Amino acid sequence: TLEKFVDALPIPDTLKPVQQSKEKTYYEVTMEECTHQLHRDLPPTRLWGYNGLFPGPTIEVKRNENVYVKWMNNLPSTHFLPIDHTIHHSHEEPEVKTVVHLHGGVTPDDSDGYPEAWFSKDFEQTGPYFKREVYHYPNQQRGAILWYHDHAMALTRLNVYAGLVGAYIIHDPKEKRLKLPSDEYDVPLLITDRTINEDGSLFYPSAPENPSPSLPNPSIVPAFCGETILVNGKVWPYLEVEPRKYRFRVINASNTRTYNLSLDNGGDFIQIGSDGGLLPRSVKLNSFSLAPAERYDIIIDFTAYEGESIILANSAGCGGDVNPETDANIMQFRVTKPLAQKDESRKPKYLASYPERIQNIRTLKLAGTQDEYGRPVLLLNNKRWHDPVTETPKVGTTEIWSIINPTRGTHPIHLHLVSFRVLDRRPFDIARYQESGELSYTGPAVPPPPSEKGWKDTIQAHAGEVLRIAATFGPYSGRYVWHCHILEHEDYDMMRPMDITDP
Ligand SMILES: [Cu+2]
Numbered sequence: 001t002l003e004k005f006v007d008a009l010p011i012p013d014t015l016k017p018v019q020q021s022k023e024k025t026y027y028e029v030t031m032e033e034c035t036h037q038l039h040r041d042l043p044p045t046r047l048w049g050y051n052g053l054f055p056g057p058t059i060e061v062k063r064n065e066n067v068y069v070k071w072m073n074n075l076p077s078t079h080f081l082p083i084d085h086t087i088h089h090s091h092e093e094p095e096v097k098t099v100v101h102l103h104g105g106v107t108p109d110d111s112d113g114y115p116e117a118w119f120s121k122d123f124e125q126t127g128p129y130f131k132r133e134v135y136h137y138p139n140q141q142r143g144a145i146l147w148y149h150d151h152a153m154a155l156t157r158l159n160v161y162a163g164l165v166g167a168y169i170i171h172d173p174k175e176k177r178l179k180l181p182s183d184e185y186d187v188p189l190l191i192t193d194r195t196i197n198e199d200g201s202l203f204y205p206s207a208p209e210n211p212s213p214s215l216p217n218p219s220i221v222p223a224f225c226g227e228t229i230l231v232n233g234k235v236w237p238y239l240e241v242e243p244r245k246y247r248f249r250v251i252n253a254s255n256t257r258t259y260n261l262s263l264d265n266g267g268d269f270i271q272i273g274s275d276g277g278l279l280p281r282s283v284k285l286n287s288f289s290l291a292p293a294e295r296y297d298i299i300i301d302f303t304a305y306e307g308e309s310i311i312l313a314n315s316a317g318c319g320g321d322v323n324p325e326t327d328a329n330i331m332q333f334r335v336t337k338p339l340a341q342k343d344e345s346r347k348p349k350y351l352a353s354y355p356e357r358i359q360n361i362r363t364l365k366l367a368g369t370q371d372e373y374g375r376p377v378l379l380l381n382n383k384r385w386h387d388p389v390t391e392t393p394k395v396g397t398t399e400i401w402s403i404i405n406p407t408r409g410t411h412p413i414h415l416h417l418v419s420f421r422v423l424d425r426r427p428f429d430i431a432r433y434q435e436s437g438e439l440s441y442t443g444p445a446v447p448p449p450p451s452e453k454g455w456k457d458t459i460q461a462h463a464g465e466v467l468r469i470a471a472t473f474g475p476y477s478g479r480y481v482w483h484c485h486i487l488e489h490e491d492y493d494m495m496r497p498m499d500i501t502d503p
């Protein structure tokens with residue numbers, strides 16, 4: 001049992017380009033097995049990290065900066081986490097496959113990290129949709145918090161759990177005039193839950209509880225809940241802050257876990273941004289939900305709290321009620337850093353302008369069948385990944401997607417390429433829907449909360465509700481994906497191709 005708040009929060013260094021001109025910025029990032037200490041009292045942990053770091057280096061770019069990243073695999077030929085060879089069928093494929101997805105990137109399709117565009121060490125073998133070694137990110141999109149992570153077919157949950165996550169921030173110079181906290185007062189917080197063995201090794205389950213002797217071994221599990229919470233690669237850390245305003249880029253980089261965050265003194269956050277950038281107006285919040293892959297861009301004002309220790313707390317359980325001594329804690333702010341200068345930052349109310357013909361309305365069901373071993377296989381609209389593509393929006397057109405969730409839990413649905421607006425949620429009769437396919441509403445539609453009135457790319461589709469979103473598909477055409485971002489679901493098999501067409 002690990003003592004909370006004994007290690008300082010690491011802040012990943014910002015990556016430096018290999019080459020840079022006015023016309024092009026070129027980066028190199030190599031996936032490496034590495035070892036890092038995750039807590040004062042733990043032996044160092046074997047991890048996989050981008051440039052050997054966990055989290056990977058923060059990448060900072062400007063809006064419209066012409067950026068290239070050569071993501072390279074220099075990993076061992078065998079995994080250290082348990083592979084289930086039964087969940088995917090294919091010559092010999094390598095055991096360790098990787099591909100990097102820039103989550104939220106407005107990105108040409110062959111640079112988006114398609115799950116079948118994977119590569120092994122030194123690109124020796126490549127998947128059937130691989131086109132290029134050096135990914136192109138034109139960054140023609142709103143300032144926002146993005147993040148990058150592995151997306152390889154049938155291995156995403158393992159490769160991400162291993163450590164392959166990092167932040168990517170797009171800065172729009174037109175927002176500088178808002179005077180939001182910046183530089184050292186603008187800090188990413190990548191939250192990852194983990195279970196760690198006494199010898200410092202990562203624990204990831206090789207089977208569910210009570211496995212039959214015919215269940216494959218290893219077997220995928222449908223959800224993972226870590227015993228410990230890390231921020232920026234350290235267990236239950238502390239951060240010393242100045243008594244002033246900070247901006248935090250809060251990223252949920254966990255496999256399954258949803259957080260519900262608050263400050264233990266009852267203090268408020270100010271939300272300034274969602275996945276897709278600044279909200280139209282700042283939103284004062286006492287708490288917020290944060291499902292896998294969601295980002296909240298927030299201001300915490302420590303001005304009136306000098307000397308205090310304030311816990312970033314969590315009320316959401318994972319596989320049970322939250323434990324006050326463990327997963328109810330994220331990190332600890334200590335307002336004990338002297339002011340380096342006057343706080344000239346602002347927490348303005350007016351942040352951005354607010355968020356068209358409906359070409360199509362797609363009705364989509366979240367469901368799942370059972371495999372020959374009795375395991376649940378989670379599916380989008382009862383199709384497998386490999387089935388012919390059905391979500392085929394036309395480029396430059398707007399659609400409404402109506403996501404029906406008759407399952408017992410929330411699924412955070414992510415669409416690549418685009419960000420979208422949230423229209424509403426509406427409860428329905430689950431038994432009736434399961435029995436007949438008939439959708440009968442048991443309540444009026446509810447508009448999104450203020451947090452969800454801007455632009456999103458990953459959205460909680462709660463149980464027994466229809467969620468409606470609207471997106472304009474573009475600016476690129478090509479082969480992308482949409483999926484549940486619970487990685488244990490994604491990999492078996494809650495992920496579908498999404499082809500944006502250009503007739
Ligand atoms: Cu993602």
Ligand SMILES: [Cu+2]
Nearest residue numbers: 103104415416
């Ligand atoms: Cu994505």
Ligand SMILES: [Cu+2]
Nearest residue numbers: 411484486489
């Ligand atoms: Cu799911």
Ligand SMILES: [Cu+2]
Nearest residue numbers: 101151414483
């Ligand atoms: Cu994805």
